[PDB]
Amino acid sequence: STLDIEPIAVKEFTEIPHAGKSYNPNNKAWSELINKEYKEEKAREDERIALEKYKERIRHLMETLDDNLGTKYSVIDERLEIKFSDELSDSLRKLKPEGNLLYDTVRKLQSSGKVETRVPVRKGRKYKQKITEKWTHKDFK
Amino acid sequence: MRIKKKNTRGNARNFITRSQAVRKLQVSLADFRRLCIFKGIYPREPRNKKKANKGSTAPTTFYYAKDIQYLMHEPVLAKFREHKTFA
Amino acid sequence: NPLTHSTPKNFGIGQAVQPKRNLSRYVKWPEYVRVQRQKKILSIRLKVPPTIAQFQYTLDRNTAAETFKLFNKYRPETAAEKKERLTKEAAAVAEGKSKQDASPKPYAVKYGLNHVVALIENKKAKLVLIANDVDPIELVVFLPALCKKMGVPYAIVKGKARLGTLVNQKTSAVAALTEVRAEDEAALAKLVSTIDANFADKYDEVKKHWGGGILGNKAQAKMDKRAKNS
Amino acid sequence: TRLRQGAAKLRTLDYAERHGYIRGIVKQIVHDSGRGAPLAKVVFRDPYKYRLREEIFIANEGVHTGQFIYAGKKASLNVGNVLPLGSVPEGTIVSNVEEKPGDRGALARASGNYVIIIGHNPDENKTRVRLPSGAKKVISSDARGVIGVIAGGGRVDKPLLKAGRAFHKYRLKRNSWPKT
Amino acid sequence: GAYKYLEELQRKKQSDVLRFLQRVRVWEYRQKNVIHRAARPTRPDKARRLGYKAKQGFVIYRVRVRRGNRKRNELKYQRSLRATA
RNA sequence: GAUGGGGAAGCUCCGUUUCAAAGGCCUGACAGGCCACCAUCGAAAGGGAAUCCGGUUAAGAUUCCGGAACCUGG
RNA sequence: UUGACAUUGUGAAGAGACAUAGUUUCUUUACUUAUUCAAUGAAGCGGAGCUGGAAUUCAUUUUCCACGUUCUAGCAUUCAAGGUCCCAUUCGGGGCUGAUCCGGGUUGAAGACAUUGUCAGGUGG
């Protein structure tokens, strides 16, 4: 009744391929596939340069004028799956696959509401866990 | 009729966190996760998290406590504790 | 970097809240820890007699290690080995018709205390081992004297579970060795020559000295400052 | 003892009191239920945890609300404050003083009463002080005492002139009235 | 066996070593509870010749009593302290 | 007035937070971290969440009926 | 109300009796482990160390002191900011310092007397 319901869809993975990453796709599928990712990344680049001009503005102003679904993580971001126009042909031996299925299927896991988004993150301690010497080595005299 | 101690029903009586669920089960995160996926139940989002978690919009998970009631009587858990004793 | 600044607090004596410090020196321990630390402390501070503290003076690392490396060759047969021996010998006596001696002789340590002390005063031992850590010490105090009397090369091992490891019991509090395969006869005979090297002259100084004349650090610093001023 | 607000006690001999001082503040001055003297709700900052720790001192005269108390061992000699008795010279009048250090006061507590340090034994630390009765007594220095007399001296001078006032008096402490 | 080497030793209740151990164990037992349990005796031969057999079901409690007579003072409490325990 | 604990030959007693390992969480990868009490009982006249009217019966109503509001928790 | 037994430990001398040497009679202090008293959410006990300062040095410091707070009815809490080094970028994870190092005696009083268990004098509705 509660175990028998399907999970929530956090940010959408699609199982279907674009059919542009396709071992000599149709060239329009190729073109639109590069174009969408170009839009997506140039947006990130423009906000990057916004941070850059922000930072240099503040660095000027420091000197110029005067003085006297939880865990803080969404699904991990998808990476590029593209072959450029030079590295594609017939003679399938040429084919270099691209895209890490670990990252991608883990995105599917976190996307389809099965698991929470997380680091594997390594060790950590709060306090010193003090060292000192045993009675026996202390008093062997 | 003994005024009813606000935060104890509805959201705060079906939605329970990881931390409280392993206070219940006493066992581990990792056996709690192995059990989760093996007996698969998945985390949820409630409609009002502040009123669920007593004022607090701290980002965390909730697990449909009825499912934990299911997880208690489960044969695999005995076997995991037997793995511990064996080790 | 510029946007963040150095606060630093002044904890001082009164003008702050204090941070969290080590307080293991200061806690309300439970009653059993407050017993079993004070017990060691008391047995340290008190002027023990020398019939005890012929304990408390004992083997070195390598001597103990070669001792146990030897004894870990001659164990008892655990029950697995016994039952295999039985299912062998049942067929062996059913077909071969031996006297239940078709199976060979064992060569193993002999680990009951009463067994040990019975073998002593027949002088059927060549080395016995003794555990320091026994709070019912009356069980054990007579052993080095008795072994001295019967001229058997006693030895006070440190650790009783260490002795249980080679009998397959939790604790044995002794072990002995009376008969050995030939291939460690020299090992044993030389081990005896290490042991008496470690003990035969130490016997003069263990007994003329009443251990545990020790003080704690505050009283020690008190008398040190007194001797310094005087 | 229905209305007794709290025992007229002192702070404890903590690290601040023992290796320094502390600023602590009065909030009000209230009449005790069945006592010849008044008391003082007075508050400090607990230095180990974040909160304002209340304390209940006895109200020496001269002290007003809205007042501070630097107090411990390194406190300046002023009315209302407290010190262990080694730092002061002879003659400093005090009250509510301790028999042993940290007992939070046995002596010189009642209304309009005090005690008078006259001597020191600085080596092998003690301090000589006279009682209100006048019996001399020498006690360790680490124990403490509040400056000044207990407020309300001259409570005794007034007669009562009728029995109902005495009944109202001795209803509060103890049924030791009417006496045979 | 060690039976007699313990028996003939524990008769010597005034030697230095046994009065040392007595000074130790009396303080231990003072700080522990009045009634309590030790999972192994301090006098095993002396147990073993009363009916002890070290197996599953035989138990040892250790116990403490005041000394002195029945105060109502000079009434002398015909119950032995051993029995009282 | 329990329990801890200690006495008492003992029925049961002294004591009520104290010579106690008393209890529960909060994230977060079985490990770290914070908090500090102490039971419980005792007021139909003390504190305290919130309701009025009219009608009605052989007999009751701030209780039912007709109408109209309020409190708490979801 | 006084005395005796044990609880009841370790010490250094003096006077001694004994085999240079251990066994016990007292007089002296001197101590902590027993026990006793009290308090604290059992938080800062004791020692050493830095920094500076008197200190008068009879060489070098013999030493001894201080070692973050005072006109004022406020406020200080989310492992603390900062510095420093790794990490794997990232939203920040970790170490050392900031906040000295070591012991364990929770902190003092008291200590072989107290006291507690048991006995014997004077007094005594």
Side-chain angles (χ1 to χ4, degrees), chain E residues 1-53:
Chain E
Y3 58 102
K4 206 87 83 167
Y5 303 90
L6 276 83
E7 187 197 315
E8 210 72 48
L9 204 157
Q10 206 96 38
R11 290 174 194 223
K12 304 299 189 300
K13 299 171 155 43
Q14 213 175 18
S15 172
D16 188 87
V17 73
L18 258 60
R19 72 194 325 189
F20 168 76
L21 273 77
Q22 170 171 318
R23 177 136 56 189
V24 170
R25 291 171 174 162
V26 75
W27 170 90
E28 199 89 9
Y29 305 150
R30 261 208 313 287
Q31 291 278 310
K32 265 178 190 158
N33 303 127
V34 157
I35 295 153
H36 76 266
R37 201 200 172 198
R40 49 177 72 270
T42 71
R43 277 214 72 193
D45 166 83
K46 174 54 148 159
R48 195 160 159 76
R49 64 188 61 271
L50 302 179
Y52 197 108
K53 293 291 204 202

Side-chain angles (χ1 to χ4, degrees), chain A residues 118-121 125-127:
Chain A
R118 266 157 164 280
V119 189
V121 62
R125 184 75 200 94
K126 195 61 57 69
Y127 274 125

Side-chain angles (χ1 to χ4, degrees), chain A residues 23-91:
Chain A
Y23 180 60
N24 319 316
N26 65 91
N27 310 137
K28 176 43 54 164
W30 202 101
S31 71
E32 68 201 53
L33 190 50
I34 179 166
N35 278 126
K36 57 179 60 46
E37 305 293 17
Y38 187 22
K39 304 335 193 296
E40 291 158 70
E41 186 60 23
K42 86 165 59 49
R44 292 171 272 194
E45 187 62 283
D46 297 359
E47 57 205 70
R48 268 185 282 281
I49 298 299
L51 188 140
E52 292 281 316
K53 58 95 185 177
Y54 187 91
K55 176 49 56 56
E56 70 95 35
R57 189 173 67 164
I58 297 304
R59 264 192 284 89
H60 301 333
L61 265 297
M62 188 89 267
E63 49 78 23
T64 316
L65 271 294
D66 61 337
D67 210 345
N68 51 3
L69 195 67
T71 70
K72 313 162 272 282
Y73 293 115
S74 202
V75 173
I76 187 165
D77 304 59
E78 182 49 76
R79 299 182 300 111
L80 59 90
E81 284 70 68
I82 289 95
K83 286 207 307 316
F84 303 119
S85 290
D86 55 314
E87 60 246 34
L88 63 94
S89 74
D90 204 0
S91 188

Side-chain angles (χ1 to χ4, degrees), chain D:
Chain D
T1 170
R2 177 184 57 163
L3 281 142
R4 288 181 176 177
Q5 308 299 348
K9 296 276 167 61
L10 276 300
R11 201 160 154 70
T12 73
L13 297 163
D14 210 335
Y15 174 41
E17 311 217 317
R18 197 171 67 232
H19 299 264
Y21 67 83
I22 194 180
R23 210 182 65 185
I25 302 90
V26 57
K27 192 62 62 173
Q28 58 184 288
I29 293 297
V30 191
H31 157 86
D32 188 303
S33 69
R35 205 203 264 284
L39 309 175
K41 295 267 156 50
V42 72
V43 74
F44 298 73
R45 211 173 72 271
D46 171 83
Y48 302 85
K49 186 169 284 194
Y50 167 44
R51 39 166 148 175
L52 265 49
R53 180 60 66 106
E54 176 67 271
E55 264 79 17
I56 284 156
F57 290 175
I58 194 175
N60 278 331
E61 211 170 10
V63 308
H64 45 249
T65 183
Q67 178 173 112
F68 291 82
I69 300 293
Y70 303 92
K73 58 178 292 308
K74 293 239 163 178
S76 170
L77 172 136
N78 285 116
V79 71
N81 302 262
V82 306
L83 281 304
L85 282 298
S87 292
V88 309
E90 70 287 7
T92 70
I93 192 166
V94 295
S95 62
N96 197 16
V97 307
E98 285 181 352
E99 290 167 353
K100 275 165 271 181
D103 201 50
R104 286 167 77 191
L107 310 180
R109 313 183 83 232
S111 52
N113 300 114
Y114 53 86
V115 284
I116 298 155
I117 184 176
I118 294 168
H120 272 255
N121 181 93
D123 58 336
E124 178 38 270
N125 55 339
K126 314 279 182 72
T127 181
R128 190 169 193 165
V129 73
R130 188 140 51 70
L131 276 155
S133 58
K136 285 306 312 201
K137 195 155 169 190
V138 174
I139 314 92
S140 184
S141 156
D142 288 31
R144 310 160 287 194
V146 194
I147 313 315
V149 73
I150 310 312
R155 165 194 84 93
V156 71
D157 56 19
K158 204 194 169 179
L160 283 298
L161 299 88
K162 54 189 183 86
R165 293 193 76 193
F167 177 65
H168 282 294
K169 172 72 171 217
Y170 289 79
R171 187 250 302 287
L172 310 180
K173 295 161 296 325
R174 60 183 74 93
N175 178 275
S176 295
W177 203 99
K179 288 310 309 183
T180 70

Side-chain angles (χ1 to χ4, degrees), chain A residues 2-17:
Chain A
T2 56
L3 171 141
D4 262 10
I5 59 147
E6 305 93 302
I8 61 169
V10 284
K11 185 234 291 187
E12 280 275 32
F13 164 82
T14 186
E15 71 92 10
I16 298 157

